[PDB]
Ligand binder design. Structure first.
Ligand SMILES: Nc1nc2c(ncn2[C@@H]2O[C@H](COP(=O)(O)OP(=O)(O)OP(=O)(O)O)[C@@H](O)[C@H]2O)c(=O)[nH]1
Ligand SMILES: Nc1nc2c(ncn2[C@@H]2O[C@H](COP(=O)(O)OP(=O)(O)OP(=O)(O)O)[C@@H](O)[C@H]2O)c(=O)[nH]1
Ligand SMILES: Nc1nc2c(ncn2[C@@H]2O[C@H](COP(=O)(O)OP(=O)(O)O)[C@@H](O)[C@H]2O)c(=O)[nH]1
Ligand SMILES: Nc1nc2c(ncn2[C@@H]2O[C@H](COP(=O)(O)OP(=O)(O)O)[C@@H](O)[C@H]2O)c(=O)[nH]1
Ligand SMILES: [Mg+2]
Ligand SMILES: [Mg+2]
Lengths: 431, 135, 53, 427, 429, 426
């Protein structure tokens, strides 16, 4: 019935989606070849949200990979669960953006976007009732940021009522791959704030910190960060795909977390996450889940929410759980540590329950907080953007392409006014 | 159409007794102009012959007045109870929706066969118009 | 109702059979396999068909 | 009492192909032609142990006709009853009404004449056609013309299939339908509309067949015609003939169009859950969600209704249900028809067919009404004829065939007068 | 006699899943639909050997509905009465009242129409909804509006689930509850409040299940509904029908909000130890620690009260207990209501379901009262509605969905007028 | 019963006519010897449309092959089913036209067309109820265009009543063999607009497009293009040869697709055409057919359809299917893409179903679209024609043969007024 169309942009986007589709296929029990071989019949009734029956139990995902160089597509094909994507959905150029947002938004976009729009429209009308689109991408690279952003804009022009999720990774200066990360991210966010329905801000800094501290893995390579992000996405969308005692779709979560149309940048967290040597010692209760959900070191954004106020928050639980305990944990975490919750919105915590656990567990939870500590990361980006734009460094790479300086000026102005609006919604009075 | 008093059986033809259970039609029952005014009553006697109101083939003569467009119930002036369920081809949350088919998009229009992929060029000047199609 | 169920099940089984049969036929199709044996001519062993060569 | 049924068109004989399957099953006549006297209304009994239908399948394409000739009813469907031309009218009213009809009609007319001479108590004719096509519309109008001048006073029911508003199989079918109606005005006696779209709706709603073909449509159309001829065939507590809808449903000589409906159409499985009693099937036969024509009688006013009943029906509750309908105000009649109903009861329950999708029921209702939502249909069909004729589209086909524009203008103005007729009569 | 039940929302049809299980177990109906005549007020005897209930589950998400369709009561719960949409209203009264309601409500009410036509001696409709959600609020209100315009004078008993003061699952539920109440005012005949933290407290304190789910709550709600329809279903010494609460609890056309209470909700061994009799259960049905709504009637004045009794109850002791309650001054009545009680007695004891947590009991009391603690509740809710409304939070959702600010203003001021009225009625003068 | 006399002109016509008779003779079960070897009875009753019983189960095709070089004849006899034709029907010159439309229309026709006309006239009276003619030729070469064009004019003069199809490939500046292509194409199109009943325009560019992108073939030699065109021909004629839920002959199609006597240039597509690397992922539903039907990358013309408006369209379905789904899919595609369809013709989609799928398949489809994007093709040709006619290049080859300049101007005017009227109706 309700349909989620998945879109992946760029190399990080492609690999995030690879792990995500692995997890989803494993959850629904389809084999790496692409045929159903599960046991319980709860798995068949809600795979229309993600797949399409081809021939005798053959389900292919409702996904659109998009890139600019065939290396990513071939790395997708080579991996397990790599033969289930339909080759028609492999749209890809041959030049490569090369960490150039201008190249991703004006030169190659102008002639790749129409083909990718054809593909996305075909896979959108291949189903009956869209829930929405779900795009995964980065804000550092070019072929993901610029191309995916132009795609988002065109999609919001075409289909203005269906929902839109953007799982975006943002750069943060402690781990800085590229040099033009602010030039990319500022323009991308300036476009997001008027196109995207809601955004979840991930960060490799936070992912690495979590894998070091909580999991205590020795070598936490990008595979494990991708698995964490995929766990987050599956915990987001579990409500559609499995029945429960209190369901909550993407539109429901958006309407309960977004109090104003421009305030849609959330920080995410997942529970439980512990080492295999430390899983022997810990207890396993809903309080044990919530103490780790609300812990500030568990947020997948590199921003301490203790430095600001929670505007709204949402929790999605998976597993057979007692709604009494769910409600009272939420109640006490709201009441006790009460300074971190805003005043002019009482009962800030939306919650939902589903009875099917993620693969490998008995109970789990996903937290989505719309806080006002995200203006911290926005300021950290804008300050580097100012530092560069003062001296006009790296500017020719964009200016010799069709872009002008007023684009940068407008991006700066929008970023600054957004952080101002976040600041004064934090510092608003009750009456 | 009007429902006349039966004087013996209307006690059994009360709408509530017929499992109607809604607010019944009393339009049909006021148009009678009975003596008492209620459904229990006696009609008025009539005398004479009825002249022809209508012309031939059912068209009202010019002199007699009529309601302007009374054969139909327009949506602006209909009440709320006279509303119908939507039929099939209109989309409704109840019955499933078959897919739609959308005009595709031929590839990037070049001087050779259009494709869905852009290539690296060896020569790039703003006015290059110079390609390498064979692979 | 039981009869209708049985007829539906048989129809679905046969639909699957025809589906797999078409799949196999068009996979082994001469075009999809690009058979150069189609280029052979009838009236010689040397001269080839002009189109399918 | 015998009635002969003619089928003009590729839809017509496909409807007859399900209808005659139902007739042989209901009278227990094996497809080779003999049983292992109610049959006398349909099957003439020749010689000894042999029953040949009173019908003519006539078409222009030989393909579906000799498909009948080569099926399993080679012995039942008789040789000269299956008239077939040599080339089609091809969705062209002119080609089917002036070029090719002139060669096929004399043969069909002097065949059916000797069928009528075989008959003794001829009740009437009933025609089956789709007005969207060329064969059904063109020579259909010509055959009805010559039938009216040859017999005239006998009743001629017509169960036509009009083009649906939004779903369509052809493009020029507005032209074909308009020019067909323009002669169906003064030729048929009672015309019954049967839109494919509403039947797709019904199959989806009640039979929950997600993917029906034309057969399921043909099968339940056969249910309807059988349900309104069963009074002639079998004895009932209150029988009503075929010459009656003539009188009780056509108030004016040019308003003869009927919104048909039927209930209960029900699946094999929903039947277990639902009780089918006389009150609820009389209610369910009045909802627009169970009508054979995609329109809405709530938008208009009922002129008159007929209610065929089959099966386990006693008179008290058909009288109670009609009373309830009268007291309900979701429906309303015109103000010039105080007595708006006609009941009719027949004893035989409707039969089921092997391979059909309908369940076995105790009772059923076939409601045939007359309203002003038909004036709604003609107007919506009038608009899309007005679009195409504004730019002189497709006209060269007809003129090149040999006709002129007097027929176009007079057919459009005749419909305009018909819209005034509905608007004024309903006042 | 018959009474048909409509269930609007994800809470509505879970409540219904508990209630119909209770009904089948009370009338001995197997889940396949046939017995191994009092059932005729809930189950219509279709044909021969089959009962299809007089209810309609209707919902916008297909999940829970086709979950029912796949569950244990496949054959019993009928194929076409379970109405299920394709996409939710999503905690949005506007979405459920203008966008999707206007396409689902006509089919819903044309099902109700033929249910009522099948009916013979209709007592009234009873509706089950939670006003916190999108569906049960929006198309709940739309359905009640069109039912009130199509039927008018018939009884519509609305057992509504309001949001709790401190325990809350949603955020926009103040907007939802206000905009739902604004029409629940002039369309519901008698409304009964059912909060959730109150029942949590009951199950935590009395039934001592330390970890309940929604199912135990739904079982208690089903017990209440059965206890107030048992007078229709089973014969009693003094039976009272549905049309009476209409008359005997609503002194003014806008004051119909009933505090519900039930006693004894007692666990299996507290029951073994305690001795049960009419006097102490009548006492227990009046203390705030046994009510179904999180409020305190000590602060208010009882305007009227109705008491259904079930089981081994004779009129003598109920009269004695009511006398003692009236003589004691712990609870007071409004001055212009000197006869503030309405007793009713039914013979059959409340039945027990295997797996249910309530012990089998010889007698029970269900009180449907009226007070001004509800006027306290509505002000407590208006507080956190005006909180979020002063900054125009979340409003863009509704306005882009199809309402405008005039409706917000009129709902707020309508609840303000209701507050003034609840103040004015309690004054003695 | 209803008869199709087939006609092939030139090298291109002979090669596609070869593949065409291979596919048709196969679906009717005729062996390369000429004897029936099918299994079902349903095939026998509808072979008179294409064949004639000669001697004891010998069915020979009702075809006429006309050309000007013996290389075509050897390429005809080289393949299998090469000895199933009739040597009397090999009416054939000896010199060769050689990319000269006038040579194909004035010098060689004057002595060839009488014998071809004798053959086709004898082949016309060999059948009782003739339905129409089928013509397959090219618009680039000389012996196909000129000679076939003259036969078109002569045939329309003798039998002005019967139907007439023209499958014509047109040259393109994107895949161009010769340089006099516009000179031949413009004159031939100029004659086709007054003589042909309707024309279904093919193009080798779009065919290479299909074989490269959809099929993912490595070396799509002409044999594959001829087979795709053959797949189109079988689809356009399935209604006569097999019974179905709703039949639609050629005349029924022309009536429903041609609103104006000069607007008879259709673009054609054919489904299903999926690569064998992606055949494992396909589903087999009329949704999957119509998504490939309306797809712009599946047209066999080099015209982007959504640059203009569909005037009318038709769908010919083969296979056991549900009309309900067929008719509602046509309903959806018309209602959603509301801008791409013309406004003053509602219900632009003719549809028909035939219960017999092609051999080896269970469900197929054929699309015939009368769009106004065809004026892109003709403008693309007319501009090169003007670019050459300004300087009068390559003109002596024509004017030295009898043709004069007013034929070229008349070719320009009808090409321009045609494009002007398509642009008007857009
Ligand atoms: N209800 C129903 N309609 C049918 C059936 N078969 C064909 N039609 C309708 O017939 C109309 C077109 O006419 P056809 O039956 O195809 O052929 P025709 O009526 O003889 O007209 P020609 O094609 O010119 O010969 C379409 O609107 C179809 O919907 C059928 O089996 N049932
Ligand atoms: N008492 C009680 N309340 C319930 C139950 N189930 C859900 N709720 C309440 O339902 C409210 C939210 O609305 P839902 O019923 O979940 O969903 P809805 O009413 O259909 O609205 P939508 O989410 O838009 O579909 C919350 O306040 C829950 O407390 C239940 O079993 N018992
Ligand atoms: N979590 C995660 N981050 C990645 C992955 N691949 C690249 N990144 C991050 O993405 C940033 C640059 O993105 P980039 O590779 O340029 O995106 P592109 O435009 O698709 O090439 C770097 O800081 C990387 O740390 C991945 O697989 N997972
Ligand atoms: N699709 C297809 N195109 C062909 C074939 N043969 C030739 N052509 C095209 O037609 C043009 C030459 O036409 P030609 O055969 O010389 O015409 P003719 O001499 O009059 O028969 C070239 O551009 C070819 O691309 C064929 O068998 N199939
Ligand atoms: Mg026909
Ligand atoms: Mg809900």
């Amino acid at each position: 019935m309700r349909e989620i169309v998945h879109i992946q942009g760029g190399q990080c986007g492609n690999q995030i989606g690879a792990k995500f589709w692995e997890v989803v296929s494993d959850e629904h029990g389809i084999d790496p070849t692409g045929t159903y071989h599960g046991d319980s019949d709860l798995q068949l009734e809600r795979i229309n949200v993600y797949f399409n029956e081809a021939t005798g139990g053959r389900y292919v995902p409702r996904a659109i990979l998009m890139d600019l160089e065939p290396g990513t597509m071939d790395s997708v094909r080579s991996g397990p669960y790599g033969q289930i994507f339909r080759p028609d959905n492999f749209v890809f150029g041959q030049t490569g953006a090369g960490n150039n947002w201008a190249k991703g938004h004006y030169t190659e976009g102008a002639e790749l976007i129409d083909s990718v729009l054809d593909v996305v429209r075909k896979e959108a009308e291949s189903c009956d009732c869209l829930q929405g689109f779900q795009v995964c991408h980065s804000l550092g690279g070019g072929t993901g940021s610029g191309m995916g952003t132009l795609l988002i804009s065109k999609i919001r022009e075409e289909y203005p009522d269906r929902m839109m999720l953007t799982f975006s990774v943002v750069p943060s200066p402690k781990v800085s791959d590229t040099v033009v990360e602010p030039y990319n991210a500022t323009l991308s966010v300036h476009q997001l704030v008027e196109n995207a329905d809601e955004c979840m801000v991930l960060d490799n800094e936070a992912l690495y910190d979590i894998c070091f501290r909580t999991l205590k893995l020795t070598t936490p390579t990008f595979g494990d960060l991708n698995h964490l992000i995929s766990a987050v996405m599956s915990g987001i969308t579990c409500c559609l795909r499995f029945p429960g005692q209190l369901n909550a779709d993407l539109r429901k979560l958006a309407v309960n977390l977004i109090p104003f149309p421009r305030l849609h940048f959330f920080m995410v967290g997942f529970t439980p996450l512990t080492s295999r040597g430390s899983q022997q010692y810990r207890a396993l209760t809903v309080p044990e889940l919530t103490q780790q959900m609300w812990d500030a070191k568990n947020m997948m954004c590199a921003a301490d929410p203790r430095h600001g106020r929670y505007l709204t928050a949402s929790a999605l639980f998976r597993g057979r759980m007692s709604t009494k305990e769910v409600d009272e944990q939420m109640l006490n975490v709201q009441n006790k540590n009460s300074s971190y919750f805003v005043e002019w919105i009482p009962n800030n915590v939306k919650s939902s329950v589903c009875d099917i656990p993620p693969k490998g567990l008995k109970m789990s939870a996903t937290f989505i907080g719309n806080s006002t500590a995200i203006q911290e990361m926005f300021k950290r980006v804008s300050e580097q953007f100012t530092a560069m734009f003062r001296r006009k460094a790296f500017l020719h790479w964009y200016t010799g392409e069709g872009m002008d300086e007023m684009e940068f000026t407008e991006a700066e102005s929008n970023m600054n006014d957004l952080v101002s609006e976040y600041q004064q919604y934090q510092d608003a009075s009750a009456e | 159409s009007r429902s006349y008093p039966g004087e013996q059986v209307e006690h059994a033809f009360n709408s509530k007794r017929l499992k109607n259970w809604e607010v019944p039609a009393v339009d049909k029952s006021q148009a009678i102009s009975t003596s008492t005014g209620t459904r229990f009553g006696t009609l008025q006697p009539r005398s004479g012959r009825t002249q022809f109101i209508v012309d031939d083939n059912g068209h009202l003569k010019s002199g007699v007045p009529k309601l302007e467009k009374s054969a139909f119930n327009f949506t602006q002036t209909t009440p709320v109870f006279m509303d119908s369920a939507p039929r099939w081809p209109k989309e409704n949350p109840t019955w499933p929706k078959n897919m739609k088919a959308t005009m595709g998009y031929k590839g990037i229009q070049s001087n050779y066969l259009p494709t869905n992929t852009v290539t690296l060029k060896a020569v790039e000047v703003p006015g290059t118009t110079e390609r390498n199609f064979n692979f | 109702a039981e009869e209708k169920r049985l007829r539906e099940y048989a129809a679905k089984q046969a639909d699957l059979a025809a589906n797999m049969a078409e799949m196999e036929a068009t996979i082994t199709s001469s075009f999809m396999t690009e058979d150069p044996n189609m280029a052979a001519s009838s009236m010689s062993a040397y001269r080839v068909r002009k189109d399918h060569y | 009492r015998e009635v002969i049924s003619i089928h003009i068109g590729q839809a017509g004989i496909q409807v007859g192909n399900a209808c005659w399957e139902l007739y042989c099953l209901e009278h227990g006549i094996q497809p080779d032609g003999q049983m292992p006297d109610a049959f006398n209304t349909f099957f003439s009994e020749t010689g000894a142990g042999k029953h040949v239908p009173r019908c003519i399948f006539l078409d222009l394409e030989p393909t579906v006709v000799d498909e009948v000739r080569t099926g399993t009813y080679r012995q039942l469907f008789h040789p000269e009853q299956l008239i077939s031309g040599k080339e089609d009218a091809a969705n062209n009213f002119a080609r089917g009404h002036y070029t090719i009809g002139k060669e096929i009609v004399d043969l069909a007319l002097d065949r059916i004449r000797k069928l009528a001479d075989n008959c003794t108590g001829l009740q009437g004719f009933l025609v089956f056609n789709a007005v969207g096509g060329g064969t059904g519309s063109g020579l259909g109008s010509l055959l009805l013309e010559r039938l009216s001048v040859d017999y005239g006073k006998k009743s001629k029911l017509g169960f036509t299939v009009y083009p649906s508003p939004q779903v369509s199989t052809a493009v020029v079918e507005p032209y074909n339908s308009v020019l067909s109606t323009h002669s169906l005005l003064e030729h048929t006696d009672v015309a019954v509309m049967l839109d494919n779209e509403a039947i797709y709706d019904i199959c989806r709603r009640s039979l929950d067949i997600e993917r029906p073909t034309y057969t399921n449509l043909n099968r339940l159309i056969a249910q309807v015609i059988s349900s309104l001829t069963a009074s002639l065939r079998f004895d009932g507590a209150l029988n009503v003939d075929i010459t009656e809808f003539q009188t009780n449903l056509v108030p004016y000589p040019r308003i003869h169009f009927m919104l048909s409906s039927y209930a209960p159409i029900i699946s094999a499985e929903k039947a277990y859950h639902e009780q089918l009693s006389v009150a609820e099937i009389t209610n369910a036969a009045f909802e627009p969600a169970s009508m054979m024509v995609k329109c809405d009688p709530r938008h208009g006013k009922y002129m008159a209704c007929c209610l065929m009943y089959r099966g386990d029906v006693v008179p008290k509750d058909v009288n109670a249900s009609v009373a309830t309908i009268k007291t309900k105000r979701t429906i309303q009649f015109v103000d010039w028809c105080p007595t708006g109903f006609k009941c009719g009861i027949n004893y035989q329950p409707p039969t089921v067919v092997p391979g059909g999708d309908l369940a076995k029921v105790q009772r059923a209702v076939c409601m045939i009404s007359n309203s002003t939502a038909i004036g709604e249909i003609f107007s919506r069909l009038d608009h899309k004829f007005d679009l195409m004729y504004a730019k002189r589209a497709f006209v060269h086909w007809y003129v090149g065939e040999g006709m002129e524009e007097g027929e176009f203008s007079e057919a459009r103005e005749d419909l305009a007068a018909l819209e005034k007729d509905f608007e004024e009569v309903g006042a």
